[PDB]
Amino acid sequence: GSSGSSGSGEKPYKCNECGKVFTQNSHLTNHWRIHTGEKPSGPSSG
Numbered sequence: 371g372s373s374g375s376s377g378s379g380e381k382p383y384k385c386n387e388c389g390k391v392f393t394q395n396s397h398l399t400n401h402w403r404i405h406t407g408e409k410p411s412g413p414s415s416g
């Protein structure tokens with residue numbers, strides 16, 4: 371079978387706005403920037 375459970379494997383830091391994953395904190399917090407404005411009105415990139 372296949373186990374699809376996150377937590378241990380994935381990193382403790384994960385963007386709760388799109389679904390990204392980073393190794394450090396400063397990286398995650400920073401990323402959010404792109405989410406907070408910056409021409410958020412357009413074609414979804416995903």
Ligand SMILES: [Zn+2]
Nearest residue numbers: 385387388390
């Ligand atoms: Zn994000």
